[PDB]
């Protein structure tokens, strides 16, 4: 269940998100702040220090992929669980990602949106985005059973 105000807070801010920049920034933060997450992304090469992470082209590309998927969740915001079924299964059964890391990533995304939008990321707008993040996290955690 979304309020119209929530829907608006999400789709207006989304219309101004650069998914390359925000997605790269968010994944960089994930890998620097929670560096154990580096284990899940061996394919990227050297991601073992901040400078290497921040300049890594594969990190940037992957961060964009993640933010595009957030865009998919938004387009399916009335039922993200159904839409994210395969993706959830993938992160569980192929990648074995502990679901606490989805929360870590969501935190990094909220931080990045704050940094990016400044005073425009008002408390109501943040609250709506936290709800959206929570719904994404729950959808990604679901096929853990």
């Amino acid at each position: 269940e979304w309020t119209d105000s929530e829907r608006f807070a999400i789709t207006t801010l989304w219309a101004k998100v650069n998914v390359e920049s925000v997605g790269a920034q968010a994944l960089v933060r994930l890998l620097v702040v929670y560096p154990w997450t580096q284990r899940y992304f061996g394919a990227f090469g050297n991601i073992s220090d901040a400078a290497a992470i921040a300049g890594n082209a594969q990190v940037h590309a992957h961060g964009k992929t993640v933010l595009d998927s957030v865009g998919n969740a938004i387009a399916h915001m009335d039922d993200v669980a159904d839409a994210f079924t395969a993706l959830s299964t993938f992160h569980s059964e192929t990648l074995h990602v502990d679901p606490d890391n989805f929360q870590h990533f969501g935190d990094c995304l909220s931080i990045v949106l704050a940094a990016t939008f400044g005073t425009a990321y008002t408390p109501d707008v943040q609250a709506a985005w936290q709800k959206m993040i929570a719904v994404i996290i729950s959808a990604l955690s679901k096929e853990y059973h």
């Binding site: 960089v28 933060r29 620097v32 702040v33 901040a50 992470i53 921040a54 935190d107 909220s110 931080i111 990045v112 704050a114 940094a115 990016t116 939008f117 400044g118 005073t119 990321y121 408390p123 109501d124 943040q126 609250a127 936290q130």
Partner: protein, 142 residues
């Protein structure tokens, strides 16, 4: 487990921010309340929980000043927050699962107001720091 580099980073952003202790604290507190509405019950005695609320302003400053105290005693965070741990556990009865929520909104506010200074390494440092403040505040719970 804060490194020298971490402490430098924390002291740096904090030095750059602590002049807005009250605005930053009001925003972090307000944001916790709106964005994580399960926390509202603890501040249900306030007439207004918005960031414009005078009681939120007053209380935000207290939060941020307590955090400044910890930054200033960053090698004894246990000690600096032990009194507050007792208060939260015994008087206020705050479920310690909430400490990460305010920690998160403080980082959000730092990023909002100081996006150039809140780099990924500074973020790391500050997240370690607030995790240690949270661990310390939880120490007297059991």
């Amino acid at each position: 487990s804060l490194t020298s580099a971490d402490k430098s980073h924390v002291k740096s952003i904090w030095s750059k921010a602590s002049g807005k202790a009250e605005e930053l604290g009001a925003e972090a507190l307000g944001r916790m309340l709106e964005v994580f509405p399960n926390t509202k019950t603890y501040f249900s005695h306030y007439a207004d929980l918005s960031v414009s609320s005078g009681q939120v302003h007053t209380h935000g400053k207290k939060i941020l000043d307590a955090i400044t105290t910890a930054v200033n005693h960053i090698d004894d965070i246990t000690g600096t927050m032990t009194a507050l741990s007792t208060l939260h556990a015994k008087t206020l009865r705050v479920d310690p699962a909430n400490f990460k929520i305010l920690s998160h909104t403080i980082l959000v506010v730092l990023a909002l107001y100081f996006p150039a200074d809140f780099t990924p390494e500074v973020h790391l440092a500050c997240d370690k720091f607030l995790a240690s403040v949270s661990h310390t505040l939880a120490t007297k719970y059991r």
